[PDB]
DNA sequence: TCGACCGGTCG
DNA sequence: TCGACCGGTCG
């Protein structure tokens, strides 16, 4: 569909939402709107189990496209009582995290593979497990992966830890704060991810709004594709922005750049914590 | 006097702005509303030079208080054509570093140190004659301190680098930014100063506006304090927020946080430079 | 250009 | 809690 937007009269613009009826936006607008204010529900909450339920309406659209285009949008305009934008600065990163939890740990269960969002009062005794407590960067990690009968330190179920997740919805930040602790972590054989949405567009005046992200090309490598393809500082990246260029077939570190949807069971997320935790 | 901030939607809320007069408040307001707008003139440097001017004009306010209650107010009010609020993100650090440099070169000029902004395309030569170009992280350094006859890599006038200064209008966890590259400067022989106005209070509905900043006390520490006074991260750090708790006499670390007004000639930060390059 | 600045929020 | 999320901006 083609997306109207007004920034601030007379300012306004479009952009191409692909994959995108304008049936199905309106239905992703009908769940996600009532969440927006709803009293008790954490908006991490509501914007997590909105972007689950987006990317099961369209899943052929893409899912940074909905979270960037869609959810922001709507949130921007739609949140009361608060301020919409810094609102969103501090819902919409746990959000993330929320959603991926929401989205794998009912895949990742029958191989006994755990995700846990490292929310306020979580992390510190998830870092030291990591062996990475105390380390420069290590309050990067998000969201810590256990699996049963095995990892780091198992707790009275049995998890024990063997890996962990940088959460980014978008890229503008210091990456280079997360490569100490991550490297760390590889070292001693666990896993270290980062999973991102890769949003960033350029809006009016002379932005095109289309949502390239900041990972830039195999050919042309921004610094942050440099230290997973060049530098080899985490053990895979996931980009669910589409238009994030994907890595060569081979990498200088030989760790790669993943691109994918969100949407159904078992993907190339799934089974890369699968494969390396067999 | 007591401020009167308009936080729109007919919502007022009130801070007091101490030794600050509301004649000395509109002498600030006449010389920097001009400036928010005026064509071909940065920002950053509307900012910054506004800053040196209030501080001139209001020797005895606190300069956090200028900064925060004051500039930012007003740069949020007056902004046209642009969003505000991430205008000044964008804005406001280059004109701490802008600031930085205006007040002290001529106190520092002296003694043979100076000052330079790293702005776009001085970076890269500036790393390298400190001896820290290419490494994961070093970039995170804003204003390079240089020493007439002392120094590595002297210009064509003699000055060689000596050092650099992070400087941060608030710290955030955004300060965790430039803990590796102050590591790796320090490891390298070079001073790394943090420099902060130590900006932070919670407006309403979240506290009283009160702008007490993010630094804690020697009793009951924020982990930025930590930072500086337990792992002795950076080799010195200037708060400008007069609320800031300076270091106890000892440190764990023996790096120390002293605290001053902005306004003037020597002061503790020049007096450190001098003795630390003799 | 397009990399990286900051602060209200809210848990 | 007091930590720490993200994006429009602009040089």
């Known amino acids: 569909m083609r997306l109207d937007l007004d920034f601030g009269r007379g300012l306004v613009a479009h952009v191409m939402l692909d994959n995108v009826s304008e049936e199905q936006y309106q239905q992703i ?15 991490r ?14 899943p052929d659209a893409n899912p940074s496209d909905l979270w960037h285009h ?16 810094q ?8 959000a993330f995290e929320v ?12 191989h006994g593979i ?36 095995g990892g780091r ?18 890229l503008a930040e210091r990456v280079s704060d997360d490569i100490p602790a991550s490297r760390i972590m590889m070292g001693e054989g666990l896993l270290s991810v980062l999973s991102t949405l890769d949003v960033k567009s350029f809006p009016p005046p002379h932005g095109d709004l289309v949502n390239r992200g900041e990972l830039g090309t195999p050919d042309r490598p921004s610094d942050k594709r440099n230290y997973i393809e060049g530098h080899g500082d985490f053990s895979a990246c996931f980009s669910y922005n589409l238009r994030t260029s994907p890595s060569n077939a081979t990498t200088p570190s030989g760790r ?18 699968v494969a390396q935790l067999a």
Request: aromatic share 10%.
């Open 29 to 43: 607008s009908d769940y996600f709107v009532p969440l927006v204010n709803k009293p008790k529900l954490k908006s």
């Open 45 to 58: 909450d509501a914007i997590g189990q909105a972007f689950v339920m987006a990317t099961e309406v369209c």
């Open 70 to 85: 869609v959810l922001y949008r709507i949130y921007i305009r739609e949140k009361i009582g608060t301020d919409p934008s």
């Open 87 to 94: 609102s969103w600065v501090r819902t919409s990163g746990e």
């Open 99 to 110: 959603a991926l939890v929401e989205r794998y740990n009912p895949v990742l269960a029958r």
């Open 114 to 149: 755990r995700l846990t969002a490292l929310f306020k009062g979580q992390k510190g005794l998830a870092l030291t497990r990591m062996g990475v407590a105390d380390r420069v960067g290590s309050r990067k990690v998000d969201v810590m992966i256990e699996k049963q009968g």
């Open 153 to 170: 330190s198992p707790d009275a179920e049995g998890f024990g830890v063997v890996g962990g997740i940088h959460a980014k919805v978008s």
């Open 256 to 273: 790669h750049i993943y691109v994918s949807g969100f949407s159904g069971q078992d993907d190339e997320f799934t089974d890369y914590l």
